[PDB]
Design a protein around this nucleic acid. Structure first.
Ligand SMILES: [K+]
Ligand SMILES: [K+]
Length: 1517
DNA sequence: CACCTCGGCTCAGTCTATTAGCTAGAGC
DNA sequence: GCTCTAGCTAATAGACTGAGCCGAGGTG
């Protein structure tokens, strides 16, 4: 195993050096391509020259005078003066010195730099690091040498080549991203070589690169690895190497460049490639060459392209860097930009900014940079074992500790050292020793690092540390490590020497070696054995930091990890809140952090992980004195604060939501691909895909379309790889039945050319994988999936469906139910959740919370020693079940349950798949099965069949609430289940007394009915459901049936209902648990076969004025039903079937005002308000706007009439209703009817225009009998069908009332009714008659027909009537009594009726003050100046009202004051989706209309209140 | 039947206005 | 590179409707 050192030490103990040089010059690849032949100057042919140790003839025809000196002394001019004289001849073009001594005087360097012909120097290190194998070369001198094996390209490099070729056929620009040490300089060669094949003739390349050292390596590198013949040109025009050290004929000017091509053109046999290695500075010179007729380039490579934006360089040089992007400077057909860090991060100019990590540069301008055609991430490289993973160790040395023990070094002033310089030295030592610091017995983590490079800001510092290093460490008190220094004042030979000294493998053990500098060894020879890179102080250029960090990536046999060490002194007295941001010393930490953000793609994920766990790549070490308390004490606080500061200040980590955009676009491609192949109904793979939909249809629903199949398939392709990364260490092959069936259909499509496009999302998978790496808890893994749901999945699924909804049920609610189900089983059934053959089921598992917290409950019991792990194992393996219809929820649920069980069984056994989960429609499961044999999901529906035959005694869950689609334009078909809906009918619908039984087929009500059926004779049901069934009108039948089935019904009402509630009502409801508007309740059902009487009801109200957090704390405190049984109260249902707010009084004895079935009521008939089903189109302040909206709808309707497909669009042109769709499908053409425009009251005291035409109205009800034509006159008392808890109110109306004029649908009691006058005259075809029934008037004696309205209307305003029958009015249509003295009511009623009909026109009140600054009566939005002040109103900028009486606001109609109705309704608003605006200023000709309206209402309010006082004492008979 | 018209009553949050906190820009 | 400022970006607070769709009732 001889080395180059052995050869040289042999020459030490003439011609033998002339031989090494000759062996080198004829075989070193780059000089094999430069020189045609080489020889000693004795065998030089006689045909040229005059009687220097060597001579060389290059293919140009020019000769070169080579000197082969073997000295042991300082090179003086005496050693050189002879050779330069011999080089003086005309026949010599140049010379080349092969020096064997790295020390050169000032004279020798100047003369060589100035010599016109040009001289290049080579040294020992150049021979050492040559491609020659000196171990197999011998001084027997056979003159046969072994050239080292050239580089072989790898799979990822081969891929980059494939992508480069493919991409550069369509575009002229593309960028190449590859992590450091992976091989992007060698890779670009094979890209150029591959491109060369298409071009017949020579292939001309331009390789740009910032440094000269970096030019030498690229030139030599390409010549070493080229498989083609190559002609090279080194063009040249802050520690860096000089152009004399290139070892290659340097090209000075544009004149020389052109001279080189004319020689290349006049060459007998032109080479395959003519590459010109140039610096970014010399672009000017190459431009002048192209200007003077130098040909354009076939390929322009831009190395270190992240600097080509120009912002990182000095203003002088910065211009040169950016000049590459345009052909104006350098013409080229195509150009490739290669870098390791396309995005550069760093510090902002502001010191006190919150964000310490901001993007400085970026190659996001894809116009000049093109797009990325290949990206080999650092994390990806570590994954495939291409690079070693790094470890950042911040070791904070204690100033207090050092100042004590290092006082000797601090004292001696002959040293230029302070606490910082000494803190740096102990930091280096402790860093290289891998010290553990402030915690095992051992002080170090492992064997010491042997090779490193330290980086300082100044040469003075670098010299300061290294020079006195040996002495300082001795005072500090194994291994003996030495230091060195290097700077730009050295030449290339010395530099090559120090790097060989560092990298020397003959280095003994117990000796480590460090080298210090500033910017000198940032670029240089790769040494894989380099163990660490130390940063001792901040740097000017961040680009240097990024370069330095990449020096440890390469793989070495001994290197497990690369290390980058940050010696930092903490100033004694430092606080943890200010530890890392408020001082210059800490700057170096943020530079490194920003450097990794640029290099490592999973670095953002690494910081998001710091929240719950400390990753392996980061380490904060507390260093005090050497081995055998001030910061030791609070170290745990300081260590944690450092990580906290990182997480806090590194800004804007958006990797998940950025990649989600890329993911959505792939899904769009995949789905389109399917659509195309499905067009070929005959195509063979399309048949296989039909069986896949058929399989989904068998397991789930008939409704599953061919599209929804492609949607599910795409969603699977997104989730599967993420879960693989999220749970890396499980049984390698996926054991999930549904997942396996999904891979079978995909592989089926892969035969047809379909691919997953997974190559690009590898950076994403790497990020996810890092979030989960060190995490070892199920509860933590669940938290990651939640963030993935929030940041990634919603956006990623946008291509398939724009709305994604998964309910994460609050854990306090789930625990309460699981706790109490166990309580119920013991007391009522004498069993437990843990008991044998007690099968639990969650039909709507979602995320799997209920099954999970069931397992954690059994765990807590196992801890107490109540049951075994054999019991829990039994439940998990046999008696736990779960159903989900959504695929994402299914995957989350399966993994969540499998993950949490694996934690419960400790190390008792490994990962076990959960067989209880099934992908189904549970409502469809109990329906009659139909045909499928060949089932992709045959293993999945097999699980269902096992579940079907199991007797279920427990059902938990949070079923989906859905009574109806929100709007018809959505075009959602509600699902049908014959067997279930039939049961639901026969029990809860047939028994209901309501006119409308819509909501009884709500999913949550379906879930209850399904659960009831499933239990059969004995069991328990525990849900969290919609509130409505407790006090809903259509549920009275249901409420009665539950008592018959179940022995016990525990109801814990969590309230939280906002919709249709007053401010007074909403306050008691409090905050909502799910942050929704519907109320919610926990309900526990228990049925027993030996319980034959009506069950009892246990009701508990959580409380009033509670936010959601307070409601959950109460559930947590209680833990169970038993814990809250004290606050529980029993409920006795009345005859009507009410549980809460029970009706009492004589209400049914009173006289009916209206009755659709029967002639008992006072009014012969009444009508509900007009219901359009499209208010934005039908209702508007502007009569013109309505016409425009409706004529648009008619023209749209008629244009596509009959065509059902446009239902899928949802345009602003038209709003659909079931009624209209039926007409649409029935081919009924429509036409505008101007006569059908009405004036009507939309909201109280708010008149609008309506297009009341039958075809465009959902429900006109009995309006044809009340207001036949637009000009019809009538009088109708309007009021809500049911107040629903509101204070009773009414408003007499002269115009067409809207259905929602009052809540719960308005109901209008008319004065007259209209019948056909039985004469054929369409202009006059309606006779009117009184609507009062006479028989009832007898039952109301002393009341004439003419006064009925004024009597009813006068009575409605009595405070007593509303108060006494408040609960009756809340759940029923008003009924009227017979009072002693009616004349009091009739008289009062008439005054109010006249007042309220003339509400628009009324005198202004006494003490009001109207202020008009300028005459502008338009209104945008009326307001109170500040919230709560009623005595003033701001009409607009110019007009304000002042001194309004506050009592006026006591007049309330519906659920809002009369004054506030005007404020609410009269404002300019625009519906976004429809794009229709409702301007109240367009209602009237009078600009002062709305102002005078308000002023009128103010007095109308007051008058009404006065008249309400004069109403008599409410007496019966 | 065959097909239309009528009677409800209930509905798994979404908007606008405010405002603390932070930054990007202008002149030094 | 700073010190101040008017302007955005967030969370944070505050305000708060229209119409679907099962089933009964009509009519020739
Ligand atoms: K000192
Ligand atoms: K385990």
């Amino acid at each position: 195993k001889q080395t180059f050192d052995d050869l040289i030490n042999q020459i030490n103990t003439g011609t033998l050096f002339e031989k090494l040089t000759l062996a080198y010059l004829k075989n070193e690849p780059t000089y094999k391509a430069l020189y045609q032949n080489v020889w000693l100057l004795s065998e030089v042919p006689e045909s040229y020259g005059i009687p220097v140790d060597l001579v060389a003839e290059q293919k140009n025809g020019d000769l070169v005078a080579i000197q082969a000196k073997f000295y042991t002394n300082k090179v003086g001019k005496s050693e050189i003066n002879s050779f330069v004289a011999e080089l003086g001849k005309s026949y010599y073009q140049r010379g080349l010195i092969v020096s064997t001594m790295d020390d050169w005087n000032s004279n020798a360097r100047e003369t060589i730099d100035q010599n016109e012909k040009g001289i290049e120097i080579i040294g020992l290190s150049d021979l050492r690091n040559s491609q020659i194998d000196w171990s197999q070369f011998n001084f027997e001198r056979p003159e046969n040498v072994v050239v080292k094996k050239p580089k072989k390209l790898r799979d990822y490099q081969q891929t980059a080549k494939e992508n480069a070729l493919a991409h550069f056929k369509e575009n002229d620009r593309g960028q190449l991203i590859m992590a450091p040490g992976t091989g992007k300089t060698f890779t670009s060669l094979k890209i150029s070589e591959a491109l060369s094949k298409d071009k017949d003739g020579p292939f001309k390349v331009l390789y740009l690169v910032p440094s000269i050292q970096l030019l030498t390596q690229t030139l030599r590198g390409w010549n070493n690895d080229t498989e083609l013949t190559m002609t090279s040109m080194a063009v040249t025009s802050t520690e860096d190497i000089k152009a004399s050290d290139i070892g290659y004929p340097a090209t000075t000017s544009s004149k020389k460049i052109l001279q080189n091509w004319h020689d290349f053109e006049s060459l007998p046999k032109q080479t395959d490639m003519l590459v010109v290695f140039s610096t970014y500075q010399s672009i000017e010179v190459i431009g002048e060459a192209q200007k003077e007729g130098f040909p354009e380039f076939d390929f322009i490579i831009s190395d270190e392209a992240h600097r080509t934006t120009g912002a990182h360089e000095a203003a002088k040089e910065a211009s040169a860097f950016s000049k590459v992007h345009s052909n104006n400077n350098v013409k080229g057909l195509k150009r490739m930009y290669q870098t390791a860090t396309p995005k550069i991060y760093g510090e902002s100019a502001k010191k006190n900014a919150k964000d310490k990590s901001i993007l400085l540069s970026s190659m996001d301008d894809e116009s000049k940079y093109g797009e990325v055609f290949f990206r080999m991430g650092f994390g990806q490289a570590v994954s495939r074992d291409i690079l070693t993973d790094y470890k950042v160790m911040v070791l904070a040395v204690d100033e207090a500790a050092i100042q004590k023990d290092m006082q000797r070094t601090l004292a001696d002033p002959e040293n230029g050292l302070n606490i910082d310089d000494v803190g740096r030295i102990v930091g280096i030592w402790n860093g290289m020793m891998r010290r553990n610091g402030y915690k095992k017995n051992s002080p170090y983590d492992g064997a010491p690092l042997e090779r490193a490079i330290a980086f300082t800001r100044t040469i003075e510092e670098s010299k300061k540390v290294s020079s006195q290093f040996e002495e300082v460490v001795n005072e500090y008190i194994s291994i003996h490590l030495s230091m060195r220094h290097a700077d730009g004042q050295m030449n290339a030979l010395q530099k090559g020497e120090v790097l060989d000294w560092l990298a020397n493998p003959n280095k003994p053990a117990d000796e480590a070696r460090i080298v210090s500098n500033v910017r000198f060894l940032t670029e240089g020879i790769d040494i894989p054995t380099l163990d660490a890179v130390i940063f001792l102080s901040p740097k000017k250029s961040q680009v240097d930091i990024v370069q330095a960090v990449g020096r440890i990536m390469r793989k070495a046999e001994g290197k497990d990890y690369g290390y980058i060490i940050l010696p930092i002194v903490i100033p004694t007295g430092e606080k943890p809140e200010t530890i890392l941001d408020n001082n210059k010393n800490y700057e170096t930490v943020w530079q490194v952090i920003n450097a990794l953000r640029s290099v490592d793609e999973r670095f953002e994920a690494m910081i998001d992980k710091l929240n719950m766990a400390k990753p392996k790549q980061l380490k904060v070490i507390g260093v005090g004195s050497s081995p055998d308390t001030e910061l030791e004490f609070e170290w745990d606080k300081f260590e944690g604060a450092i990580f906290g500061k990182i997480v806090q200040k590194v800004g804007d980590r958006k990797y998940l939501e950025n990649w989600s955009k890329d993911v959505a676009k792939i899904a769009e491609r995949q789905i389109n691909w399917i659509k195309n192949k499905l067009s070929d109904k005959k195509d063979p793979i399309s048949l296989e895909f039909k069986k896949f939909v058929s399989s989904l249809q068998h397991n789930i629903n008939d409704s599953i379309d061919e599209k929804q199949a492609a949607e599910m398939l795409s969603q699977h392709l997104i989730t599967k790889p993420i879960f693989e990364a999220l749970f890396s260490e499980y049984s390698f092959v996926n054991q999930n039945p549904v997942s396996q069936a999904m891979e079978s259909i995909v592989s089926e499509l892969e035969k047809a050319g379909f691919a997953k496009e997974q190559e690009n999302l590898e950076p994403l998978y790497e990020s996810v994988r890092m979030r989960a790496e060190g995490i070892e808890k199920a509860e933590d893994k669940q938290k990651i999936i939640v963030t993935l749901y929030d940041k990634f999945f919603k956006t990623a699924f946008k291509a398939t469906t724009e709305r994604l909804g998964i309910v994460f049920t609050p854990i306090e609610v789930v625990d309460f139910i699981v706790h109490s189900v166990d309580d119920v089983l013991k007391k009522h059934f004498g069993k437990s959740l843990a008991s044998k053959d007690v099968h639990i089921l969650d039909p709507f598992t979602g995320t799997g919370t209920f099954i999970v917290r069931t397992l954690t409950y059994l765990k807590e019991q196992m801890d107490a020693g109540e049951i075994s792990l054999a019991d829990i194992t039994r439940k998990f393996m046999k008696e736990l079940h779960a159903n989900e219809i959504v695929l994402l929820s299914y995957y989350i649920a399966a993994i969540n349950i499998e993950s949490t069980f694996d934690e419960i069984n400790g190390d008792e056994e490994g990962y076990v798949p959960f067989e209880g989960i099934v992908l189904t429609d549970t409502f469809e499961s109990t329906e009659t099965e139909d045909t499928l044999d060949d089932d992709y999901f045959g293993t999945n529906d097999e699980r269902l069949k096992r579940q079907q035959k199991v007797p279920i005694t427990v059902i938990m869950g949070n079923p989906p609430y859905s009574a109806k689609q929100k709007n018809e334009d959505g075009n959602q078909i509600r699902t049908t289940y014959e067997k279930l809906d039939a049961s639901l009918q026969n029990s809860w619908v047939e028994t209901s007394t309501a006119t409308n039984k819509n909501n009884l087929f709500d999913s949550y009500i379906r879930a209850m009915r399904w659960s009831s059926d499933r239990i059969s004779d004995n069991g328990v049901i525990g849900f969290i459901t919609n509130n409505s069934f407790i006090d809903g009108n259509a549920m009275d039948g249901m409420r009665q049936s539950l008592l018959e089935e179940f022995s016990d019904i525990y109801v814990l009402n969590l309230k939280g209902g906002i919709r249709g509630k007053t401010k007074d009502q909403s306050a008691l409801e409090g905050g909502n648990i799910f942050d929704i508007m519907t109320g919610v309740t926990i309900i526990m059902l228990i049925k027993k076969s030996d319980y034959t009487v009506e069950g009892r009801i246990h009701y508990l109200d959580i409380g009033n004025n509670l936010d959601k957090y307070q409601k959950l704390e109460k559930l947590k405190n209680w833990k169970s039903l038993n814990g809250a049984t004290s606050e529980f109260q029993n409920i006795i249902p009345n005859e009507k079937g009410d549980w809460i707010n029970q009706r009492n009084s004589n209400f049914d004895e009173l006289i009916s005002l209206g009755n659709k079935k029967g002639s008992d009521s006072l009014f012969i008939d009444y009508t509900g308000g007009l219901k359009t089903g499209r208010d934005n189109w039908s209702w508007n302040f502007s009569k013109e706007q309505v016409e425009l909206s409706m004529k648009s709808s008619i023209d749209y309707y008629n244009q596509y009439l009959g065509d059902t497909n446009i239902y899928k669009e949802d345009v602003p042109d038209i709003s659909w209703t079931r009624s209209l769709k039926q007409r649409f499908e029935r081919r009924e053409t429509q036409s505008w009817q101007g006569e059908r425009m009405y004036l009507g009251m939309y909201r109280p005291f708010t008149k609008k225009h309506v297009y009341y035409a039958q075809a465009w109205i959902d429900r006109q009800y009995q309006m044809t009998k009340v207001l036949p034509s637009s000009t019809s006159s009538n009088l109708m008392i309007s009021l809500s069908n049911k107040t629903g808890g509101k204070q009773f109110s009414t408003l007499i109306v002269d115009v067409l009332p809207d259905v929602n004029l009052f809540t719960g649908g308005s109901q209008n009691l008319p004065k007259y009714l209209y019948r056909n006058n039985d004469t054929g005259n369409l202009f006059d075809n309606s006779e009117k008659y009184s609507a009062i029934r006479h028989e009832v008037l007898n039952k109301l004696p002393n009341l004439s027909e003419e006064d009925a309205m004024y009597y009813v209307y006068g009575l409605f305003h009595s405070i007593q009537y509303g108060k006494v029958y408040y609960e009756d009015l809340a759940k029923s249509f008003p009924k009227i009594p017979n009072v002693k003295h009616k004349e009091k009511y009739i008289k009062i009623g008439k005054e109010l009726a006249d007042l309220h009909l003339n509400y628009e026109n009324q005198p202004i009140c006494e003490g009001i003050d109207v202020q008009i600054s300028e005459l502008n009566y338009r209104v945008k939005k009326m307001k109170h100046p500040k919230k709560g002040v009623l005595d003033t109103i701001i009409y607009n900028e110019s007009i304000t009202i002042k001194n309004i009486p506050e009592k006026a606001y006591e007049y309330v109609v519906n659920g809002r004051p009369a004054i506030e109705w005007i404020i609410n309704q009269y404002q300019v608003k625009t519906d976004k989706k429809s794009g229709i605006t409702d301007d109240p200023n367009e209602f009237s000709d009078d600009p002062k209309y709305i102002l005078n309206l308000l002023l009128s209402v103010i007095t109308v309010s007051m008058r009404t209140l006065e008249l309400i006082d004069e109403l008599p004492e409410f007496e019966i008979q």
